[PDB]
Amino acid sequence: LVLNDLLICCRQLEHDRATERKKEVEKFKRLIRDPETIKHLDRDAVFRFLQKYIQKETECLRIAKKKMQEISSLVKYFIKCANRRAPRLKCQELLNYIMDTVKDSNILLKDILSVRKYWCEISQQQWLELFSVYFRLYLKPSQDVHRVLVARIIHAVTKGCCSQTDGLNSKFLDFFSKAIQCARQEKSSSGLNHILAALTIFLKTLAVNFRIRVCELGDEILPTLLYIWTQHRLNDSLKEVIIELFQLQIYSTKWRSILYNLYDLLVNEISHNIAVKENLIELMADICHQVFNPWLQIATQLISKLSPLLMILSQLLPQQRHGERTPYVLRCLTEVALCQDKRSNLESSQKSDLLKLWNKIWCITFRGISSEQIQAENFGLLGAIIQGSLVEVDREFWKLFTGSACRPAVCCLTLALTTSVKMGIEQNMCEVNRSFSLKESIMKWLLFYQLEGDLENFPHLVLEKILVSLTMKNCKAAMNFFQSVPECEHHQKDKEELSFSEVEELFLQTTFDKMDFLTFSVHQNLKESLDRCLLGLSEQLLNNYSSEITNSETLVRCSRLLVGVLGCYCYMGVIAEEEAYKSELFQKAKSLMQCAGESITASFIKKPFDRGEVESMEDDTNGNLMEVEDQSSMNLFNDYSQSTIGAINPLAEEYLAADIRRKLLMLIDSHLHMYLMLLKELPGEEYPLPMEDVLELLKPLSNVCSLYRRCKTILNHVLHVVKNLGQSNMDSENTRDAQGQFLTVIGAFKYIFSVRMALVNCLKTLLEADPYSKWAILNVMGKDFPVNEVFTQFLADNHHQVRMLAAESSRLLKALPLKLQQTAFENAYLKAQEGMREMSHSAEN
Numbered sequence: 001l002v003l004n005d006l007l008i009c010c011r012q013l014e015h016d017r018a019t020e021r022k023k024e025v026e027k028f029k030r031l032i033r034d035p036e037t038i039k040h041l042d043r044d045a046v047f048r049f050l051q052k053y054i055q056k057e058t059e060c061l062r063i064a065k066k067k068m069q070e071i072s073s074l075v076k077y078f079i080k081c082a083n084r085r086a087p088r089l090k091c092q093e094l095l096n097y098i099m100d101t102v103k104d105s106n107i108l109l110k111d112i113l114s115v116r117k118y119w120c121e122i123s124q125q126q127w128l129e130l131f132s133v134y135f136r137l138y139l140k141p142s143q144d145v146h147r148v149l150v151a152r153i154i155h156a157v158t159k160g161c162c163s164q165t166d167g168l169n170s171k172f173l174d175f176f177s178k179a180i181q182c183a184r185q186e187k188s189s190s191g192l193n194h195i196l197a198a199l200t201i202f203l204k205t206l207a208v209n210f211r212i213r214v215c216e217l218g219d220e221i222l223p224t225l226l227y228i229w230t231q232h233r234l235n236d237s238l239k240e241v242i243i244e245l246f247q248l249q250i251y252s253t254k255w256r257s258i259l260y261n262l263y264d265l266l267v268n269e270i271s272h273n274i275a276v277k278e279n280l281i282e283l284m285a286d287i288c289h290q291v292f293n294p295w296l297q298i299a300t301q302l303i304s305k306l307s308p309l310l311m312i313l314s315q316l317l318p319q320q321r322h323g324e325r326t327p328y329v330l331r332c333l334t335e336v337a338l339c340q341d342k343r344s345n346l347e348s349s350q351k352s353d354l355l356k357l358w359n360k361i362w363c364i365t366f367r368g369i370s371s372e373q374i375q376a377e378n379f380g381l382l383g384a385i386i387q388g389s390l391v392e393v394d395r396e397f398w399k400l401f402t403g404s405a406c407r408p409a410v411c412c413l414t415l416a417l418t419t420s421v422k423m424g425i426e427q428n429m430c431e432v433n434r435s436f437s438l439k440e441s442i443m444k445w446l447l448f449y450q451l452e453g454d455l456e457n458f459p460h461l462v463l464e465k466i467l468v469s470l471t472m473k474n475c476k477a478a479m480n481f482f483q484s485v486p487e488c489e490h491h492q493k494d495k496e497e498l499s500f501s502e503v504e505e506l507f508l509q510t511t512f513d514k515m516d517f518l519t520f521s522v523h524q525n526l527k528e529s530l531d532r533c534l535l536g537l538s539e540q541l542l543n544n545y546s547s548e549i550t551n552s553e554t555l556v557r558c559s560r561l562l563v564g565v566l567g568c569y570c571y572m573g574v575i576a577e578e579e580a581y582k583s584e585l586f587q588k589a590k591s592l593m594q595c596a597g598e599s600i601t602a603s604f605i606k607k608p609f610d611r612g613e614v615e616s617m618e619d620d621t622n623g624n625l626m627e628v629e630d631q632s633s634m635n636l637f638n639d640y641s642q643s644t645i646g647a648i649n650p651l652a653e654e655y656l657a658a659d660i661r662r663k664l665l666m667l668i669d670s671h672l673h674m675y676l677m678l679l680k681e682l683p684g685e686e687y688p689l690p691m692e693d694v695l696e697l698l699k700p701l702s703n704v705c706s707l708y709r710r711c712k713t714i715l716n717h718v719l720h721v722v723k724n725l726g727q728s729n730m731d732s733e734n735t736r737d738a739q740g741q742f743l744t745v746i747g748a749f750k751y752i753f754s755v756r757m758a759l760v761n762c763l764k765t766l767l768e769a770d771p772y773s774k775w776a777i778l779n780v781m782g783k784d785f786p787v788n789e790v791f792t793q794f795l796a797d798n799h800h801q802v803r804m805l806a807a808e809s810s811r812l813l814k815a816l817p818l819k820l821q822q823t824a825f826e827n828a829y830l831k832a833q834e835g836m837r838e839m840s841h842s843a844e845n
Contacts (some may be wrong), residue, residue: 002044002392005030005037005040005045006024006044006048006771007032007049008026008027008030008034008160008435009048009051009055010110011023011026011027011030012024012027012048012051012055012058012059015055015059016058016059016062016063017025017058017059017060017062017064017065017558018063019558020060020063022400024077024155024556028080030075031080031081031083031084033337038084038085038086038087038498039276040088041084041089046089048090049081049084049087049089050086050089051222052078052081052091052092053081053089053091053092053095053096053099055275056077056081056096057080057099058503059077060072060077060126060312061075061099061104062840068107069107071106071107071109072107072109073639074256075107075109075110075113075556078096078100078109078112078188079109079111082113082116082117083743086122086174088120090125090159090246091122092126093117093121094125094127095122097110097114098131098227099118100113100114100117101131101134101802102138102579103134103136105823106269108143108145110143111147111148111151111478111491112147115147115151115154115464115575115604116607117606118154118158118276118607118608118845119606119607120193120509120610121159121606122154122162122607122608122692123610123611123614123692124156124611124690124692125162125692126159126163126165126373127226127348127844128571129155129159129163131155132155132156132158132159132377133168133184134174135148135151135152135155136152136155136172136173136590137172139145139176140172140173140176140191141435142740144186144716146185146186146189146190147189149187149188149189149190150188150189150190150192150604151184151189151192151591152173152189152190152192152193152196153192153193153485153603153605153608154192154605155194156192156195156196156199157199157605157607157609158608159199160194160195160196160199161608161611161612161692162608162611162692162733164732164733164735166200166202170193171197172199173193173196174193174212177193177212177215177216177547178212178215178219180221181212181216181219182219183214183219185791187225187229188226188228188232189230190229191226191228191229191232191233192232194233194235194236195232197209197233197236197240198236198239198240198588200242202735202771203770203771203772203814204243204810204814205813205814206244206247207238207245207620207810208810209240209241209243209244210244210252211243212753213236213237213256214252214255214256214258214259214262216233217259217262218232218259218262220233221262221266224269224761226623227279230786231279232281232284233522234282234283235282237246237256237288238282238285238289238461238822239258241253241256242288242289244256245289245293245504251294252834253293256294256295260290260293263283263286263289263290264290264446265314266283266304267280267283267287271280272312273451274308274351277311277312277315278315280315281315283516284315284316284318284319284322285323287316287319287320287323288322288323288324289320289321289323289651291320291323291324292406295319296327296497297321297327297328297331297334298337299313299316300313300331300334300335300748302316303316303317303338303342303685307348308464310346310348310349310352311348311351311352312340313762314342314348314352314630315355317335317352317356317358317359318355318358318359318362319357319421320359320362321358321361321362321509322362325365325366326366327366327444329366329368329790330364330470331366332363332366332374333373333374333377334361334730335359335376336377337374337377339356339359339360340377340381340384341386342356343356343357343381344381344385344388345388346385347581349399350391350395351394352604353388353394354394354397354401355400356398356399357385357394357397357398357399357401358379358401360378360401360402360404360405360632360774361400361401361404362785363375363405364404371761375405378405379405379711380401381401381402382405382408383408385398385402386402386408386411387412389414393422396422396423396424396427397423398423399423399424399426399427400423400426400430400432401426401781403427403431404435405432406433406434406701407427407429407430407431407433407434407572409431409439409441410436412431412439412441412442412445413442415428415431415439415449416442416444416445416448416449416450416451416452417448417452417453418449418453418455419453419454419455420451421455421456421458421460421461421464422458424449424452424457424461425464425467427469428467428468429463429464432470434469436473437468437469437471437473438567438802439610440471440473443477445471446471446477446478447478447481447482449468450468450478450481450482454485454505457486457489457561459503459504459507461631462507463571463572464513465508465511465514465671466511466518466571467514468511468514469511469514469515472515472519473530474519482514483528484528486505486508487526487528487531490505490508490531490532490535491531494535496538496539497685498540501539501553501554501556501557501558502532502535502536502538502557503556503557503559504533504538504560506532506536506537507534507560507577508532509529509532509582510522510529510574510575510578510579511577512525512528512529513574513578514571514574517574517578518570518571518574521582522574522577523577524734529578529582530582531585532582532584534581536571536583536586536587537586537587539554539557539569540586540587540590540591541590542554542596543594544546544587544590544591544593544594547597548657551624552620552677554624555623555624556625558627558628558630558631559622559627559630561591561628561630561631561634562627562634563575563579564576564631564634564637565579565637565638566637566668572643576638578639579634579638580634580714580825581641582733584642585642587631588641588642588645589642589645589648591628591631591632591648592632592645592648592652594628594643594778595628595629595632595649595652595838596652598621598622598624598625599625599652599655601621601622608795611692611693611706612628613692613693614661614693615661615693615695616749618662620660621664622659622662626665628664629666629669632646632666633648633669635763636669636670642831650675650678653667654677654678654680654681658730661695664681664682664685664695664698665698665709667681667682667685667702668698668699668701668702669701670702670705672705672709673712673713675709676709676712676716676719678702678705678716678718679702679706679716679720680719682696682699682702682719683719683722684701684724685769686722686723686726687722691726694736696726697706697736697740699723699740699741700724700740700741701740702741703720703723703741703743703744704740704743706720706723707721707723707744707746707747717724717756718752719757720744721752721756722752723741724744724752724755724759725751725752727741728755728762729751731833735771738766738775739763739774739775739777739778739798741759741762741764742775742778742780742781743779743781745757745759745760745763745781746781748790759783760797761800762796763775763782764800764801764803764804765804766778767801767804767805767808767818767822768804768807768808768818768819768822769818772814772817772818773817773818773822773823773825774823776817776822777825778810779825779826779828779829780828780829780832782797782801782829783795783797783798783832783833784829784830784832784833785833785837785839786833786835788835791833791835792835793832793834795835795837796839797824798830801829802826802841802844803818804821805819805822805823805826805844806819807819808820808822813815823841823844826840826841826843
């Protein structure tokens with residue numbers, strides 16, 4: 001046993017290069033069972049799992065002293081060693097992975113295998129992962145596996161994920177890039193460099209970024225072949241140099257504009273339905289670059305005509321509307337005139353009209369210069385549009401999109417008629433936009449609109465009941481008529497097995513309160529509401545008993561349990577007893593245990609992002625439990641009858657954790673005093689994470705509660721210290737972190753001693769190296785409401801800040817932010833209050 005595999009390991013010496021031809025299979029067989037050998041690997045077979053490197057090449061690479069399958073077999077053997085597959089073995093997964101480099105004459109068998117080997121390894125580390133460059137060197141070389149091409153992005157992820165690291169100006173690829181951009185294939189996966197570039201983008205000069213762009217572009221422009229790459233291409237400067245181009249306006253961009261020239265007709269290059277334009281939504285977004293780089297009429301001229309050509313400017317139209325505000329109110333007519341002709345008549349003209357309607361909407365806030373002639377023409381078109389008055393949908397959009405020209409009301413007929421919400425709940429609001437009273441002139445409209453409200457009998461309306469309710473003016477003429485009207489349906493359709501979960505039905509629940517409690521006084525009708533209570537009490541237990549399928553709808557139903565309160569307001573504020581008192585015990589445990597019920601039970605970037613997988617995308621089932629947890633979140637939301645269910649729930653939640661990360665997510669989602677162990681979740685949990693994960697990102701919201709609390713009073717900070725020790729002690733590996741730890745400083749009074757109610761030396765230390773001074777924001781609170789010697793201390797800090805500024809290529813242009821705009825930021829704090837010494841700093845200026 002102890003030596004049994006050691007025999008096989010001794011046999012691995014005999015399964016080394018010479019005699020290997022059998023015992024390796026026998027090992028692979030010994031592998032094929034190897035009882036508790038991974039346990040021994042967790043015990044002594046790590047060395048075997050390491051011999052699974054160490055002996056392996058000693059078997060293999062020594063035997064390696066045609067027929068590449070031997071490697072592939074050895075690869076299989078490794079893959080078999082890998083097929084331990086519980087296994088981790090990062091060292092070989094480095095070294096053997098290093099050994100899995102070319103440069104370890106290869107079968108390239110690690111190509112997906114390392115990629116395969118990249119999942120929870122790349123959970124753990126990189127270290128350098130400099131072999132990314134070797135890999136980069138590898139792809140830089142001649143032979144074809146497009147595998148590396150996106151697998152670059154893996155290395156990029158390897159940097160881009162936990163690395164807190166980058167370098168070489170990403171230049172090697174960048175160098176290769178335009179080199180590749182001479183002529184090549186395998187580009188879209190290879191486009192992953194853009195991501196790497198995007199990844200690279202951190203805290204560096206867009207100038208430093210600016211190199212290759214048009215360089216690819218025209219060379220790029222020649223082929224379309226993968227729009228994906230092209231899209232992938234379409235990305236970057238359309239942010240980055242857009243980040244450059246969002247800038248100098250306030251602050252070769254012409255060449256970029258020239259590079260953008262390449263776009264201008266690249267618009268024309270579009271073959272495609274609106275599909276190319278649809279695909280060009282990005283390019284439309286990229287066209288927003290073209291917005292203001294002044295051509296808007298040349299667009300209207302490019303809009304001079306045209307069947308699909310309609311769609312283009314039509315597409316372009318919203319982009320024009322969208323990509324900024326402030327086109328020419330002069331050009332408005334130029335559009336509006338051009339718009340007048342086109343937008344009306346076609347099957348497509350609707351989209352144009354919708355755009356025009358949107359453009360019209362876009363015209364609305366367009367302001368400052370009044371000639372209403374266009375508006376009149378529009379008001380004329382307002383008829384001419386309302387003249388068309390026949391559509392599937394976009395009129396629903398176009399409606400207020402026309403109506404915002406105010407928002408005639410002659411179509412309040414169609415509003416009373418709205419059964420024929422998409423427009424309406426808006427258009428009605430757009431109508432309710434007239435006044436409390438104004439649009440109401442027909443006394444029948446409201447119930448007619450409530451008869452127009454017989455259609456959904458539109459969850460998007462969540463407050464539009466009050467919007468529906470807006471006509472009362474204390475008349476209450478139709479008041480209860482509609483109230484029972486569905487309440488009739490509420491009875492009239494009453495079935496336990498029927499469709500249309502009561503969500504939408506309960507969606508009327510406080511709509512009454514959306515009239516009166518909007519405008520006991522509420523609790524009077526609570527029965528007519530409590531009708532929903534049973535309606536709510538209708539479906540509750542069923543899957544709550546069942547633990548079977550189909551409850552996604554119910555989850556979707558339970559999704560409305562996310563109608564929230566969480567603050568101080570009239571309207572949703574009115575929802576509270578309309579919810580909370582409304583369900584006192586109703587589902588209270590009934591929902592609750594269902595959680596305890598739930599309790600026991602292109603993607604390629606996730607090799608590193610298995611943690612991101614560990615973050616996010618795992619499981620739809622119990623996403624309900626999440627939806628439940630969300631529904632459960634109401635408890636906390638409620639927590640300011642049957643509250644201790646919440647207390648139970650955490651006490652329940654307290655139990656232990658893997659998908660319980662999502663529970664740990666819930667663990668955040670939170671006596672509050674007594675609740676301290678709610679943290680104690682993290683206390684193991686965080687400690688468990690060596691956390692290449694963002695994981696404590698949520699910890700902030702948790703710490704937010706910790707804040708919302710912090711002897712009995714004590715350990716939380718003491719823990720949250722460890723939370724800080726999670727970082728300050730870490731003193732490394734954020735790229736992210738501390739922004740909440742920054743936020744943590746609210747309520748100012750060894751290892752943890754210095755920080756507690758000071759901590760700012762970190763905030764001081766927070767200054768220089770970051771996404772550049774990510775922390776720089778954190779300046780804001782720094783003194784933000786101090787006391788005097790505190791302000792003095794704060795000054796001393798402000799000094800210590802000014803002091804901190806000391807330490808800070810274009811890293812100076814970075815220090816320009818990084819010392820300076822940061823120190824300039826350091827001002828902005830001084831921009832706050834007092835104890836100024838204000839330009840006594842600017843003495844430094």
